[PDB]
């Protein structure tokens, strides 16, 4: 992979059960 | 966070 899949996985780890939004 | 090194702490600014 490129950058975004790894970034979105890191967001999922950091933001736990409070979720996140993501627009590239 | 892909050319420059980020920290999981710096990512908190994207949550809810």
């Amino acid at each position, epitope marked *: *992979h490129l*950058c975004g899949s*790894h*970034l979105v*996985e*890191a967001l999922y*780890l*950091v933001c*736990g059960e409070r979720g996140f939004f993501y627009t590239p | *966070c*892909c*050319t*420059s*090194i*980020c*920290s*999981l*702490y*710096q*990512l908190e600014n994207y949550c809810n």
Partner: antibody, heavy 121, light 108 residues
Framework: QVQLQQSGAELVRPGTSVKVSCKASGYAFTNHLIEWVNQRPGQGLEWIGV????????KYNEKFKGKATLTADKSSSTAYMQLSRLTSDDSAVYFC??????????????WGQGTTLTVSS | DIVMTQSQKFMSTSVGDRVSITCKASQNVRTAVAWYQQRPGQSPKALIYLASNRHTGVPDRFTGSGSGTDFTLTITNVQSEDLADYFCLQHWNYPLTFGSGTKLEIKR
């Protein structure tokens, strides 16, 4: 297999500069962050800095800013660490280690074998 | 800078007993903590990632737990090849910092 082979030991005089090599093999080299860590005789471990080898981005321990310079050669799949203004307090074993891609969600899952640096007049 | 405190610099045990090595963060580090093993004359080797996950190939007697500040590496049925140094580390924010280590020794 993940594998990091470091350059040989270094025995130099204070004030000089040194350049340590760390050759990666067994994975996609370009996007895995490479950390650098030192170990002084009998002590624990201190983090120096990290490099994104594909992008060339870096982040330094504030104590090592301007002492350590981290680089990457994507051609050879080699990471480099240069240490200037060497004093005897810098005598230590220096490790490179691999972490996850682009950003550190997993830190130092494979470690090189270490490079002994001795600084003496 | 975050300090990772391993309150016990030495820990004695007998082969087959249970040991529990603590590590307290100075501030909240979520689950971005790692555990390493270092045998004498060797490089460190990774054991636990993201607080509680075993790295591939590491025996199941090793177990990492914790969230927030109080982190723990529990070894059940300690074996002789487990006699070594154990370091925690936080990678929640830079610089990454290690605990100052716990040396696991045989009792007699």
């Amino acid at each position: 297999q993940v594998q990091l082979q470091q350059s040989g030991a270094e025995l130099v005089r204070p004030g000089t500069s040194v350049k340590v090599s760390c050759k990666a093999s067994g994975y996609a080299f370009t996007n895995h962050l490479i950390e650098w860590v030192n170990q002084r005789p009998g002590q624990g471990l201190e983090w120096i800095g990290v490099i994104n080898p594909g992008s060339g981005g870096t982040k330094y321990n504030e104590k090592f800013k301007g002492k350590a310079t981290l680089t990457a050669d994507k051609s050879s799949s080699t990471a480099y660490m240069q240490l200037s203004r060497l004093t005897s307090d810098d005598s230590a074993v220096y490790f490179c280690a691999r972490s996850s891609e682009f950003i550190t969600t997993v830190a130092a899952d494979y470690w090189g074998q270490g490079t002994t640096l001795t600084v003496s007049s | 800078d975050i300090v990772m405190t391993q309150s016990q610099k030495f820990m004695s045990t007998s082969v087959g007993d249970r040991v529990s090595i603590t590590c307290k963060a100075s501030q909240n580090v979520r689950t971005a903590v790692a555990w390493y093993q270092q045998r004498p004359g060797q490089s460190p080797k990774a054991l636990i990632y993201l607080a509680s996950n075993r790295h591939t190939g590491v025996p199941d007697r090793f177990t990492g737990s914790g969230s927030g500040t109080d982190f723990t590496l529990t070894i059940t049925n300690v074996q002789s090849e487990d006699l070594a140094d154990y370091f925690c580390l936080q990678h929640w924010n830079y610089p990454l910092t290690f605990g100052s280590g716990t040396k696991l020794e045989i009792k007699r």
